[PDB]
Amino acid sequence: RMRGHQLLSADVDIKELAVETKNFSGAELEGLVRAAQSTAMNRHIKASTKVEVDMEKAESLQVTRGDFLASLENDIKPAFGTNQEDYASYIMNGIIKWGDPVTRVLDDGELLVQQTKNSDRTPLVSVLLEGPPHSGKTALAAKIAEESNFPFIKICSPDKMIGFSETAKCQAMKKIFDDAYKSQLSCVVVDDIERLLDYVPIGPRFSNLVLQALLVLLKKAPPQGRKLLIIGTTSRKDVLQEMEMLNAFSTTIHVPNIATGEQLLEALELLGNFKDKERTTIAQQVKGKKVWIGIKKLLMLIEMSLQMDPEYRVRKFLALLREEGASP
Amino acid sequence: RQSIINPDWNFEKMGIGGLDKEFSDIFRRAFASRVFPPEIVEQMGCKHVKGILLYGPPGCGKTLLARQIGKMLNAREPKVVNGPEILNKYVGESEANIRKLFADAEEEQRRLGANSGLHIIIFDEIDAICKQRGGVHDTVVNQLLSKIDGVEQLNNILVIGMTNRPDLIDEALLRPGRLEVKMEIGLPDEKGRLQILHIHTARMRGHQLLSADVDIKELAVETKNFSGAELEGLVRAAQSTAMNRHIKASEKAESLQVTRGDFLASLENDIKPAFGTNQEDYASYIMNGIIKWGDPVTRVLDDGELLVQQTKNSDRTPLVSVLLEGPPHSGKTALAAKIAEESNFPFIKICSPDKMIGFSETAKCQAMKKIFDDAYKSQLSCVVVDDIERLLDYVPIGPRFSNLVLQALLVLLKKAPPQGRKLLIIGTTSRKDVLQEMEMLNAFSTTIHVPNIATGEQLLEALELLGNFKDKERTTIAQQVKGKKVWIGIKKLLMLIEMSLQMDPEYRVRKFLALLREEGASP
Amino acid sequence: QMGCKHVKGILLYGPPGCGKTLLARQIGKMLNAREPKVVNGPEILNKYVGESEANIRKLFADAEEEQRRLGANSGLHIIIFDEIDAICKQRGSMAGSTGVHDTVVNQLLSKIDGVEQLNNILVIGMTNRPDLIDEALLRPGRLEVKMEIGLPDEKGRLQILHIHTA
Amino acid sequence: IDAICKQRGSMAGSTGVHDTVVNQLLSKIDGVEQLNNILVIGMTNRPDLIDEALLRPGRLEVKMEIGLPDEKGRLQILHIHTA
Amino acid sequence: AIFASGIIMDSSISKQALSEIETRHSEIIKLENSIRELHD
Ligand SMILES: Nc1ncnc2c1ncn2[C@@H]1O[C@H](COP(=O)(O)OP(=O)(O)OP(=O)(O)O)[C@@H](O)[C@H]1O
Ligand SMILES: Nc1ncnc2c1ncn2[C@@H]1O[C@H](COP(=O)(O)OP(=O)(O)OP(=O)(O)O)[C@@H](O)[C@H]1O
Ligand SMILES: Nc1ncnc2c1ncn2[C@@H]1O[C@H](COP(=O)(O)OP(=O)(O)OP(=O)(O)O)[C@@H](O)[C@H]1O
Ligand SMILES: Nc1ncnc2c1ncn2[C@@H]1O[C@H](COP(=O)(O)OP(=O)(O)O)[C@@H](O)[C@H]1O
């Protein structure tokens, strides 16, 4: 109807918008179109004094793809799709290549993602990521999920379940996993498993109902004709193995820490904080030793050391690194 | 046809400031298609928006905006639903009341069609009726959903909703074709404060009642994290103070004027912001000042501001933490309070276990969550936690404690605030080892140590600063204390001094020495 | 000429039986106000649905009708509550964990300051536990003045004996 | 017949009408006057909700339970439905 | 779901609105006859 009266520009491609919008319900397309039309119309109205309509440019009113892009980015937010705010809040400081393990982990993730798309005998595969604390294992999972390119991607973390009872957590997990069954492809990421059970070394204590609900939900195949991928993160592996929970998982991936002077120097150079003169001394000090520190801890130490005086940063940074040490 | 917007309406008269972007977006999305020439709109064949939702903290200008929007349009007088006034007891009354609201709109639409006038419906405290589904609240939501968008179509209605808890609102009522334009009204930054003061001090200036020594810029800069309602309260209190002073001083009119002194007094005594700094807490927790009895106090004070400046200036670390620990009766809470006060932040709060006497776990968790949520709606904050072991209810027997509170505290110590904001959490404790066993020391970014008095010289310096004993008595103690070391806290020392001071004028020293010897322990 | 609105309510918190109702009656009798409407907190509550709200709303009809009839030339009205804290408590935030008396608080908040403005009313509250009151009911728009009445000192006892023995 | 007949003294609404209705039905079906030309047939889906005093011999004796057909039942239903 | 339906008891028929209404009109017949005779 809009194109009937030559109201649509000649630089708007419908197929591009159709491909861009993934898993958009019917009403959201109408909402997007209405928002774009309203934004286009608003360009000829000024609201600061007695309302006056510029009736001279009304003959050159046209809708440009820029309006559609702006309305999509700002106004319309889907519900069964994906949003870029989660990846902007979980990949805050980005990802950098400080060695070989990152590439290997990314390759393994990509290989796992290809199987759950071109396979008919295993329509449900799960993997577990584990490592020492402060090793940055959630960012890698988020990056893998983003690079999967599946239509429906969701992240289930305990950050939204503060104060909830075990029953509430179980009924949130059930709701999420049920909503995940209404698509031809889906990825679900479980974050900090050892904090979804309320584990505490003393006793030890934990929630049995949540553990059972999680053990029963890892072996339920979706409706015929659909696929699913489950990723999970955890920093205490032995504890999970003790409760006989590693059987449900199909494989495992190990994320190591920095363990050489060259890797630390490369990471420092990539970050771009210290000058070359200081780099000379820091290399001369580190090369003849070994280190054991995570990336997050290194960033925090660098930030804390940067607050000193111009001619005291290096000494305090070295003192902090030695105090923390390695403790293999 | 007469235009929808009154010919005599103008923004300057609306009397609203600090909400330019929100009003511009509302006008662009809602009323944009109701002002263009109808002949053009007819070709596009597009339906108008049917709802608007506004949410935010108490006292920021929601109802005012709805009233102005209602009185802006040339439509007929709007309806009003003051809270949940549609409930009733007989089986089949709430639905009838709900249906009775849309009768006139449907009748007018049937009678006229595409030339009907506009209707307005204003809902107040919507979250008290429209709650998520799943026989007291599930047969009004269905009626409302069916009426808003049913088998028959309507194009001459507009629903405005208001609430303080947007999360509890149903989900099926917030989709396109329904109340979809959602806006948030938040504490105003500086320009908003200046605009609000100018709006609220306009009539008085026209009649030359404002003194010449009052500058609105200083008032705007001084008041931080106030909300419009608070600024209005401040002005009214100043005016009332001036009027009361004039009347009580002594026909005597024509000389009344508002001066800077009245504004200062009203701000200092009358107005207490909800998201601002309160000096009563600092007065209550620091009851004997701070005395520099040795290096450790200076070291701690020179370490605290470094962390404060790190959290204030950096950009890759929007969250910082620290833990103060030491032997009992060492004065940790006072040092933490002083460090917080010296930060000069615009939002400081202290959470202590003495306001939760007899509270269950599911109340302490709620209190902590509410405090953190409040701290999350300001561009800077500082939350202090003291007596962690009392929050956890730890007892050596067992051991026994609350797991839910521990998990909530652990989760709340790593969740960063929204993008662009910063936070700083300080915590104290007197039992480090137990915290380490529970695997809690791995979440704090740094730790600090406050030492006890370990040398006679420090004790003599503290006694001098206190100013209790004279030179002869001072030397009397020095002769016996300088020959060895001591181990006593500041609070215990004050208690011992107070206990000793109640003896006879000549026997104070002997009892003080006896008490010190009895209390003395192995370092 | 200044154009300043009047205060809309006050709150008095203190030990029971120290002279709070008497002061409330005298303050009304001093401003040439009409008969004050006294209401007891715990008596408002009811078990049927939609009965507490009706009782809360029944106390404002006269003010609204007088304001409508006489416009801005109406007199003054006063409403006094008793154990107000027993009908106003902090509202829950988590979904599915709300209280049983939130509708009453919502209705009171809507009536005290809603879309339509009333300028011929005044509210006095008296309580003993001022720390259990909601937060939205203490902002400068409502109940913006709080006072404490304590146990009397020697001068107070002497004056009380004088008054009661004169 | 289960909508209007139920165990008396159980409703928590306006039971003042249901008890009277059930009592009137009981009195009329078999009371002081003897009838010999009346036949009552009743269907339902909740056998255990009907009032016990109404199922005593003399008022409602014949009770039948209809279940799922067996193999010969299916081989007969299909034949009936395709003549 | 605390609520309850209600039952009604009509009164639009009063057995005491038939005595006075009938007795009242029974006395105007003589007056009408007398006035008719007077007019004739
Ligand atoms: N190559 C990298 N690998 C991992 N993290 C990286 C890398 N480059 C940058 N980062 C940053 O490291 C930060 C570490 O945060 P994250 O929550 O993933 O840590 P974690 O050690 O897995 O968690 P936890 O503290 O709960 O044990 C991420 O925010 C990411 O921004
Ligand atoms: N930007 C502003 N300009 C002028 N006045 C303002 C502004 N914001 C708030 N106010 C003041 O707000 C008061 C009305 O408050 P309002 O009705 O918006 O409260 P609210 O947010 O609905 O409160 P609550 O939800 O707690 O009931 C008026 O006195 C008005 O002066
Ligand atoms: N320089 C100082 N440092 C610490 N406290 C001081 C100092 N000078 C005086 N004080 C007094 O020390 C008192 C110690 O009180 P506080 O509650 O902080 O003690 P604490 O030892 O941290 O607590 P707890 O008894 O719970 O272990 C404070 O009331 C303050 O009056
Ligand atoms: N300041 C006072 N002056 C005179 N009488 C007082 C005073 N304070 C209390 N009383 C007396 O105390 C009694 C109870 O007062 P009342 O206000 O009814 O108490 P409550 O606050 O419990 O309602 C009355 O007889 C009143 O005269």
Author numbering:
A (entry chain C): 413 to 740
B (entry chain B): 205 to 338, 345 to 460, 468 to 740
C (entry chain A): 247 to 412
D (entry chain D): 330 to 412
E (entry chain G): 175 to 214
Task: Reproduce text from the manuscript describing this model.
The membrane-anchored SNARE (soluble N-ethylmaleimide-sensitive factor acceptor protein receptor) proteins provide the energy to drive membrane fusion in various cellular contexts, such as intracellular trafficking and exocytosis. Supercomplexes of NSF, α-SNAP, and either a syntaxin tetramer or one of two binary complexes of syntaxin—SNAP-25 reveal atomic details of SNARE processing and show how sequential ATP hydrolysis drives disassembly. NSF comprises three structured domains connected by flexible linkers—the adapter N-domain followed by the D1 and D2 AAA+ domains. Six NSF protomers come together to form the active form of the enzyme, a homo-hexamer.
To gain insight into the structural nature of binary complex formation and disassembly by NSF, we prepared a complex of NSF, ɑ-SNAP, and the binary t-SNARE complex (21bin20S) composed of full-length soluble SNAP-25 and soluble syntaxin-1a (1–267) in the absence of divalent cation (i.e., non-hydrolyzing conditions) and performed single-particle cryo-EM. First, models of the NSF D1 and D2 domains with substrate bound in the D1 pore were built into two high-resolution (2.88 Å, 2.92 Å) classes from a single dataset, differing only in the state of F protomer engagement with substrate. Next, the dataset from which they were derived was combined with two additional datasets to enable the 3D reconstruction of weakly populated states with ordered density for the ɑ-SNAP—SNARE spire. Classes with evidence of NSF D1 domains engaging ordered ɑ-SNAP—SNARE sub-complexes were carried forward; eight 21bin20S models were built into reconstructions ranging from 3.39–4.01 Å in resolution, differing mainly in the orientation of N domains and a sub-complex of three ɑ-SNAP molecules and four SNARE motifs relative to the D1 ATPase ring. All classes revealed substrate-bound NSF without Mg2+ needed for ATP hydrolysis and disassembly, and share the same overall architecture, with a spire composed of NSF N-domains and the ɑ-SNAP—SNARE subcomplex on top, the NSF D1 ring in the middle tier, and the NSF D2 ring forming the bottom tier. As such, the stoichiometry of the syntaxin—SNAP-25 complex observed is 2:1, the dominant species in solution. Three ɑ-SNAP molecules bind the 2:1 binary SNARE complex; a flexible linker between SNAP-25 SN1 and SN2 blocks access by a fourth. Of the eight 21bin20S classes with the 2:1 binary SNARE complex from the dataset collected under non-hydrolyzing conditions, six engage syntaxin and two engage SNAP-25 within the pore of the D1 ring. Docking the 2:1 binary complex structure back into the seven individual 21bin20S reconstructions reveals an apparent preference for syntaxin, with six of eight reconstructions featuring the N-terminus of syntaxin H3 bound within the pore of the D1 ring. Taken together, we observe that the NSF D1 ring can bind to at least two different SNAREs, syntaxin, and SNAP-25, in various configurations.
